[PDB]
């Protein structure tokens, strides 16, 4: 089977959440592929299916639990399994579709949504932008419940909001220690609050950065990447040097050229 990472919200602390995200990261990459100090995720083309996913099992304030499946090539969530059923976002190509059929194989019920995991559809399904969807311990606990009772009937809107919560707190937290940081702070000071423009813009640009960083001149971007501060103030990124404490993982965009010695 696939590697499994566990985490409970009930007694979750800053140490528990940090241990959780630090372990998820360690499963996503060897890695053993590092460029400008940032680890790269394995290349999708030719990834053997036995190495293609990781499993994240989430426990509620009640014992009820849900197991999430994350695509190793981009750390994104591809679907989940409530105990008796398995749900999957609509893949965008055949090879992807084939790959998920190796997930939760012993389950009895097997569904594939008529939509993908991209934030736009999830936002229209939830009725709210992630800008307007609180995150933190409370929201995650609350989310991982509606993900169980969906197989038993909690309509789509409330379900979509739960994905939005989980993806940011897990998929994005692994991608960005900055996003991991903000989650860690919401737990330390025990607050629930939506993400600010720095988190949202970081999410939107994780692929744009992965291209820039891997296609940079010794870390110099061929063109600047626009981001936003916590106050919504825009600013341009010209160099890998400043993202090193911000981003933790990149999607493989190309082979690593020979190093420029001397």
């Amino acid at each position: 089977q696939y590697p499994i990472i566990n985490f409970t919200t009930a007694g979750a602390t800053v140490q528990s959440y940090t241990n959780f995200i630090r372990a998820v990261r360690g499963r996503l990459t060897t890695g053993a592929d590092v460029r400008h100090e940032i680890p790269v995720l394995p290349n999708r083309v030719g990834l053997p299916i036995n190495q293609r996913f990781i499993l994240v099992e989430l426990s509620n304030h009640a014992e009820l639990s849900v197991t999430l499946a994350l695509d190793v090539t981009n750390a994104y969530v591809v679907g989940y399994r409530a105990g008796n059923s398995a749900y999957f976002f609509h893949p965008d190509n055949q090879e992807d579709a084939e790959a998920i059929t190796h997930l939760f194989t012993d389950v009895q019920n097997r569904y594939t949504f008529a939509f993908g995991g991209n934030y736009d559809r999830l936002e229209q399904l939830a009725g709210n932008l992630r800008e307007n969807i609180e995150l933190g311990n409370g929201p995650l606990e609350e989310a991982i419940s509606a993900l169980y009772y969906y197989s038993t009937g909690t309509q789509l809107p409330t379900l979509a909001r739960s994905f939005i919560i989980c993806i940011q707190m897990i998929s994005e937290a692994a991608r960005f220690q900055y996003i991991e940081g903000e989650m860690r702070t919401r737990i330390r000071y025990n607050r629930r609050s939506a993400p600010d423009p720095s988190v949202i813009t970081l999410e939107n640009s994780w692929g744009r950065l992965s291209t820039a960083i891997q296609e940079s001149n010794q870390g110099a971007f061929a063109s600047p990447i626009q981001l936003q501060r916590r106050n919504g103030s825009k600013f341009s990124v010209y160099d890998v040097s400043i993202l090193i404490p911000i981003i933790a993982l990149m999607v493989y965009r190309c082979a690593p050229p020979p190093s420029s010695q001397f």
Partner: nanobody, 127 residues
Framework: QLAESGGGLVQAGGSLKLSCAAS????????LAWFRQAPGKEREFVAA??????????YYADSMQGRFTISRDNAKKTVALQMNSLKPEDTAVYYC????????????????????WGQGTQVTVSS
């Protein structure tokens, strides 16, 4: 909004064809199915087709399998039901069903999974 057309009248053992034309960009991601009600019987699952990204497998009920065939034209946003060697049992009103929530499901046969329904069209088989 499912627009169903093409019933008809046929001497037993012949052929007809029903078509359903949808209007929606995400049409390619829909689980699609046909249901029929024969008078005296309740509404009955007939056939289903999975979205391309959901395997795309086609499924039929045993009493209709072989004789019938379901297909979609994603470019034309149309579904088809080609019926061959029609028995008089096959005289019924037929419906299209589309799942906007679902691409593929082990429980496809359930009418509960489908959100949109074409207007029933009459198939008559004489002998």
């Amino acid at each position: 909004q499912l627009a169903e057309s093409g019933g008809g009248l046929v001497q037993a053992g012949g052929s007809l064809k029903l078509s359903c034309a949808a209007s929606g960009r995400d049409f390619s991601m829909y689980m699609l199915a046909w249901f029929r009600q024969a008078p005296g019987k309740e509404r009955e699952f007939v056939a289903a087709i999975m979205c391309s990204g959901g395997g795309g497998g086609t499924y039929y009920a045993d009493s209709m399998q072989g004789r019938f065939t379901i297909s979609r034209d994603n470019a034309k946003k149309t579904v088809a039901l080609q019926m061959n060697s029609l028995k008089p049992e096959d005289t019924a009103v037929y419906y299209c069903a589309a799942s906007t929530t679902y691409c593929s499901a082990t429980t496809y046969s359930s009418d509960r999974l489908y959100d949109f329904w074409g207007q029933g069209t009459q198939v008559t088989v004489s002998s």
